[PDB]
Amino acid sequence: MDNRELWKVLNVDLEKHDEFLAPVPAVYRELFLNRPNRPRAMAYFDAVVGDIHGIRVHELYNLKQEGKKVFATFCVYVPEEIINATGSACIGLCGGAQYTVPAGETVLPRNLCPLIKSAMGFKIERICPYFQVADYVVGETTCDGKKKAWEILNEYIPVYVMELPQKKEERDRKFWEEEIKDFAQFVEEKTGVKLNAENLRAGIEKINKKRKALKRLSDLRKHNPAPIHGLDVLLINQLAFFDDPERFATKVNELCDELEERVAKGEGVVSKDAPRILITGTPQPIPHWKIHALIEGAGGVVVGEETCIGERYFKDLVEPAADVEGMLKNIAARSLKVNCACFTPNTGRLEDILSMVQKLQVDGVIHYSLQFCQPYGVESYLVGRELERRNIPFLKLESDFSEEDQGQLKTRIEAFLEMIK
Amino acid sequence: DNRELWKVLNVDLEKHDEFLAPVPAVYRELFLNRPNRPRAMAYFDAVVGDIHGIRVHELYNLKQEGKKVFATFCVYVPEEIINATGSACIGLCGGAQYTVPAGETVLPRNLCPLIKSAMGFKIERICPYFQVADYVVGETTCDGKKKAWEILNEYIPVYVMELPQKKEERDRKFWEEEIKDFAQFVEEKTGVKLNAENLRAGIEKINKKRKALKRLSDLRKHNPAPIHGLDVLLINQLAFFDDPERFATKVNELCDELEERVAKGEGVVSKDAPRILITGTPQPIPHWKIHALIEGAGGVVVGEETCIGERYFKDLVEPAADVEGMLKNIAARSLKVNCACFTPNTGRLEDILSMVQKLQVDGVIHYSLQFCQPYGVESYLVGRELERRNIPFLKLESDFSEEDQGQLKTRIEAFLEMIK
């Protein structure tokens, strides 16, 4: 093939790479392709999944040859606009694979979040071309696991760490603006492009246009019957981390046009009696589609996702400004409006949940979080207690990237859907 | 009068007695019958003989006299300011497993045993040192305690200080302003406003205490060892519950006895037993399992790089002329702690190596609690850098369960069997 020599040049272990890529087509066929009632604008995304380690890696390399850089992030708090204002890429390989768990566990204790260990293994075994072509990695201080794993990752690839505060009063708002300014200076130093009003406003328009299409897609999901299955929207939000901000937004808008066509005639992918489910908790990387597949494989339909591969990524858009200082202020202020479970207290995400259930008309919420995720694990008590106080059905789930939790999670989901008919 | 106090403070006396039932035998086996113990140790034993009594009487008397009792869970708390504003300050980290399942009703099972034990002790209402507390001072360190303060607020009230994540200039100013906020807090809640001459009094008292503990810790650099490590662990544990003045005096008299023990050349064990440095997470009372397993097999522990240890008495406040300068100095002193919640943290590695050099240690053990992420992940870099310097290393980790020693003993002996 052609990607063969690109992987070889990028220093990719080809034996492990093939052993990892082996079972993906059958899973993607059973979970995605074989399902009927599918929209027509999704084939594009299928093609992307059919070559996720191919075309986009070529694009990243060929644009790296132009004098640009490739920045890799793990947190949506990192300003995508500031990076894309210099003509450089901003990708986010949050890996959700078990194949790379025993690898990343060689340096991390086994009682850690599966995402961190999966990404660490992806890097240690040289098996992810996105991780190879990436020049830098931008970390932050959200959980103890990632904050400490940066100290190990920096020996493998350079790591720049932003410091995010833990509360959101006046001084915290101020401190984050200074942090964004330091990151912008670092970006100017590393890319060699001075930030003007032209390029910065251009990048802000670019990222806001990317987020607007996803928020339109999310707003289209609150109709009855459901015009699209939740697994497809999940895959869309998942692909939103490696794709070009223009073509992705265009295809998302075309899919939204098709879904509006469906809504105009009352077409739906599920029977109208089916339960509608809302998901809240930790983001689900790719390919970690287990929960959506199990929920929609018993008759239910997911209408919303309150994760950072859900609505928390595209909910807030940047406000315009005049000079560069105002643009940086607005970027930092947009970033700090994310009601992540690392702040204390975090009473805004609860308002988010209670408003999303009324918007999407949800019959029951499910609080799925990863195993050994303490920030989202502890807050679940308060979230569920408050939701039960207000007479809302609630289910707490927890699993890892293992593939064969079918029986237990299946019984849980089926009992829930039987109860909240 | 003890049961009178426990009735005043709402104690489910049944669970209280069932918790205190199998404790005197443990303390007799681990301490009382162990030979060659010094004489000045007697006082400390008396404290454990009345662990829920006379000190609770003193705290409740201070309460009835119109003054507060501040409960803490960290080292960064400016206890100097609390001592300045008259009120008392006590630390009470989680200790036993009896309260773990109860605490597991509001917290996940995959959390640290310390937070679970603390939450259980609070909910079960069987701790006089907790049932007498007026406030709690939490911090923003780990994920567990940060997200558990919210659930704790529904019970006894909680004030939270925000600790930064690095030690640069912005973090220094941030911590300075947070110390100012906590000073305003104690000014308002204790009624007393602080001036220079009264703030320096608490500064000097807490200094005296820390430097007395520092003298005792330095005294352990003699071969053969003058004192066993379990007694020093008990001293550092009781340093959070006792009264500072008399405790400093008692530790000074113990140091006076150890001076003669060093001059005569008498040791608690032979000059062949291995010297072990413990480093990692703190060991609250009664978590004497690790030291007991290390020494009972035939070793000695001459150093504890924990916060119930070297990191509670290494740094002391610098002097200043005015109140603002004294507050800035208290903040700068508290920020000198090299915990595993900042990034990077090479200072702790420098401390470990310097203690290995000074204390003549021939065996290093890194012990952290179960489900502890900060130290549990930093252990990799710590061991990797220590292995280069050709230092024997051993990673250990467990919870508050009793009969897990079967896996620990086999892990301990072998270590001591090869570092001869």
CA distance B146 to B122: 17
Three-state DSSP at B227 gives: coil
B305 interfacial to chain A (CB closer than 8 Å):
no
Three-state DSSP at B175 gives: helix
Compute chain A's Rg from CA coordinates: 21
Burial profile A81-90: b = 16 or more Cβ within 10 angstroms, e = fewer: bbbbbbbbbb
**Closest CA–CA distance from residue A404 to any residue of chain B (Å):** 21
Tell if the CB–CB gap between B377 and A109 is shorter than 8 Å: yes
A298 C-beta neighbours (distance < 10 Å), count: 14
Tokens of A407: 């029986």
Residue B408 amino acid letter:
L
Q: What is the resolution of this structure in A?
A: 3.2
Burial profile B103-118: b = 16 or more Cβ within 10 angstroms, e = fewer: beebbbeebbbbbbbb
Phi, psi angle pair for B350, to nearest 5°: -60, -45
Residue pair B219/B262 in contact (Cβ under 8 Å)? The answer is yes
Positive or negative: CA dihedral B234, B282, B292, B266:
negative
Q: Which of residues 272-301 of B touch A (CB under 8 A)?
A: none
A337 interfacial to chain B (CB closer than 8 Å):
no
Comparing CB atoms, the residue among A175, A372, A378 nearest residue B148 is A378
Where do runs of H (alpha helix) occur along A55-158? 55-64, 80-84, 101-104, 114-124, 129-133, 144-153
**Closest CA–CA distance from residue A397 to any residue of chain B (Å):** 12
Tokens of B328: 């800035």
Tell if the CB–CB gap between B143 and A375 is shorter than 8 Å: yes
Phi, psi angle pair for A277, to nearest 5°: -125, 140
Q: How far is CA B419 from CA A311, B361, B378, in A?
A: 56, 11, 24
Q: How far is CA B134 from CA B24, B70, B118, B155, B239, in A?
A: 29, 6, 16, 11, 20
A165 C-beta neighbours (distance < 10 Å), count: 22
Residue pair A330/A241 in contact (Cβ under 8 Å)? The answer is no
CA distance A104 to A156: 12
CA distance B415 to B274: 10
First to last CA, chain B: 52
In terms of phi and psi (left: phi > 0; alpha: psi -120 to 50; beta: otherwise), the region of A270 is beta
Comparing CB atoms, the residue among A112, A141, A378 nearest residue B165 is A141
Total number of residues shown for chain A: 421
Residues 6+ apart with CB under 8 A from B49: none
Strand partners, B397: B368
In terms of phi and psi (left: phi > 0; alpha: psi -120 to 50; beta: otherwise), the region of B142 is beta
Tell if the CB–CB gap between A171 and B150 is shorter than 8 Å: no
Residue pair A245/A92 in contact (Cβ under 8 Å)? The answer is no
CA atoms within 13 A on the CB side of A105: 11
- Residue given tokens 């027509």 in the structure block: A40
CA distance A96 to A119: 8
CA distance B139 to B159: 9
Nearest CA among A396, A373, A288 for reference residue A112: A373
For the beta sheet containing A276-281, the strands, ordered from the edge strand earlier in sequence to the opposite edge, are A301-306, A276-281, A364-370, A394-399
Residue A170, Cα to own-chain centre: how many angstroms?
29
Q: Which of residues 116-175 of A touch B (CB under 8 A)?
A: 141, 143-145, 147-152, 161, 163, 165-167, 171-172, 175
Burial profile B70-84: b = 16 or more Cβ within 10 angstroms, e = fewer: bbbbbbbbbbbbbbb
Strand partners, A45: none
Tell if the CB–CB gap between A145 and B107 is shorter than 8 Å: no
Tokens of B94: 């989680």
First to last CA, chain A: 51
Q: Give the nearest chain B residue to A147 (CA atoms).
A: B343
**Closest CA–CA distance from residue B389 to any residue of chain A (Å):** 19
CA distance A397 to A407: 13
DSSP assignment of B301-347 equals: EEEEESTTTHHHHS--PPP-SSHHHHHHHHHHHHTT---TTSSS--H
Q: Kind and range of the H or E element at A75? A: none
- Show residues of chain A in contact with B340, CB under 8 Å: 148
Q: How far is CA B320 from CA A106, B199, B204, B317, B329, in A?
A: 49, 11, 12, 9, 7
Residue B16, Cα to own-chain centre: how many angstroms?
23
Phi, psi angle pair for B296, to nearest 5°: -60, -25
Q: Kind and range of the H or E element at A140? A: strand A136-140
In terms of phi and psi (left: phi > 0; alpha: psi -120 to 50; beta: otherwise), the region of B360 is left
Tell if the CB–CB gap between A166 and B149 is shorter than 8 Å: no
Strand partners, A277: A302, A364
Nearest CA among A90, A87, A47 for reference residue A313: A90
Select the residue from A144, A150, A346, A349 to test the B interface by mutation, using most B Cβ atoms within 10 A. A144
Tell if the CB–CB gap between A109 and B150 is shorter than 8 Å: no
Q: How far is CA A309 from CA A207, A360, B117, B406, in A?
A: 16, 18, 35, 45
Residue A240, Cα to own-chain centre: how many angstroms?
8
Comparing CB atoms, the residue among A109, A151, A178 nearest residue B343 is A151
B6 C-beta neighbours (distance < 10 Å), count: 21
Positive or negative: CA dihedral A124, A125, A130, A134:
positive
Per-state percent for chain B, helix, strand, coil, to nearest 5: 55, 10, 35
**Closest CA–CA distance from residue B409 to any residue of chain A (Å):** 22
Three-state DSSP at A138 gives: strand
Residue A418 amino acid letter:
E
Positive or negative: CA dihedral B332, B74, B366, A123:
negative
CA distance A172 to B25: 51
Per the entry, the structure determination technique was: X-ray
A345 interfacial to chain B (CB closer than 8 Å):
yes
Q: What does the angle CA B261 – CA B24 – CA B397 come to, to the nearest 5 degrees?
A: 75
Select the residue from B371, B377, B397 to test the A interface by mutation, using most A Cβ atoms within 10 A. B377
A375 interfacial to chain B (CB closer than 8 Å):
yes
Residues 6+ apart with CB under 8 A from B249: none
CA atoms within 13 A on the CB side of B15: 15
- Show residues of chain B in contact with A379, CB under 8 Å: 147, 150
Tell if the CB–CB gap between A111 and B110 is shorter than 8 Å: yes
Q: Give the nearest chain B residue to A179 (CA atoms).
A: B170
Residues 6+ apart with CB under 8 A from A148: B340, B343, B373, B374, B377, B378
CA distance B80 to B182: 12
Residue B194 amino acid letter:
L
Nearest CA among A334, A339, A281, A283 for reference residue A308: A283
Residues 6+ apart with CB under 8 A from B284: B93, B94, B95, B114, B117, B237, B308
CA distance B100 to B107: 10
Residue pair B342/B167 in contact (Cβ under 8 Å)? The answer is yes
Q: Give the nearest chain B residue to A153 (CA atoms).
A: B381
Cis amide prior to A129 (ω within 30 degrees): no
Tell if the CB–CB gap between B379 and A166 is shorter than 8 Å: no
B387 interfacial to chain A (CB closer than 8 Å):
no
A397 interfacial to chain B (CB closer than 8 Å):
no
Comparing CB atoms, the residue among A150, A167, A372 nearest residue B162 is A167
CA distance A305 to B30: 55
Tokens of B367: 């012990």
Residue B13, Cα to own-chain centre: how many angstroms?
27
Q: Give the nearest chain A residue to B162 (CA atoms).
A: A166
**DSSP category for residue A286:** B
Comparing CB atoms, the residue among A163, A344, A372 nearest residue B165 is A163
Size of interface A-B (CB pairs under 8 A): 101
- Show residues of chain B in contact with A149, CB under 8 Å: 377
Tell if the CB–CB gap between A345 and B106 is shorter than 8 Å: no
Q: What does the angle CA A90 – CA A91 – CA A97 come to, to the nearest 5 degrees?
A: 165
Compute chain B's Rg from CA coordinates: 21
**DSSP category for residue A42:** G
Residue A10 amino acid letter:
L
Residue pair B239/B304 in contact (Cβ under 8 Å)? The answer is no
Tell if the CB–CB gap between A112 and B373 is shorter than 8 Å: yes
- Residue given tokens 């260990």 in the structure block: A117
Phi, psi angle pair for A366, to nearest 5°: -130, 125
Three-state DSSP at A30 gives: helix
Tell if the CB–CB gap between B144 and A371 is shorter than 8 Å: no
Strand partners, A71: A90, A136
Q: How far is CA B124 from CA B19, B54, B109, B127, B149, in A?
A: 11, 22, 18, 8, 17
Residue pair B133/B156 in contact (Cβ under 8 Å)? The answer is yes
- Residue given tokens 């300011």 in the structure block: B81
Nearest CA among B362, B372, B371 for reference residue B394: B362
Q: Give the nearest chain A residue to B146 (CA atoms).
A: A344
Q: Give the nearest chain B residue to A176 (CA atoms).
A: B170
B280 C-beta neighbours (distance < 10 Å), count: 24
Nearest CA among B172, B171, B158, B183 for reference residue B78: B183
Q: Give the nearest chain B residue to A161 (CA atoms).
A: B343
- Show residues of chain B in contact with A163, CB under 8 Å: 164-166, 171
Comparing CB atoms, the residue among A111, A151, A344 nearest residue B149 is A344
Exposed, middle or buried, A258 (CB in 10 Å: 0-12/13-18/19+)?
middle
Residue B275, Cα to own-chain centre: how many angstroms?
22
Residue pair B80/B328 in contact (Cβ under 8 Å)? The answer is no
B181 interfacial to chain A (CB closer than 8 Å):
no
- Show residues of chain A in contact with B379, CB under 8 Å: 109
Nearest CA among B391, B402, B405 for reference residue B277: B391
Residue pair B400/B100 in contact (Cβ under 8 Å)? The answer is yes
Residue pair B128/B167 in contact (Cβ under 8 Å)? The answer is no
CA distance A332 to A173: 8
Tokens of B177: 């302003």
Tokens of A307: 């994760």
Residues 6+ apart with CB under 8 A from A195: A82, A85, A86, A184, A187, A188, A324
**Closest CA–CA distance from residue A381 to any residue of chain B (Å):** 7
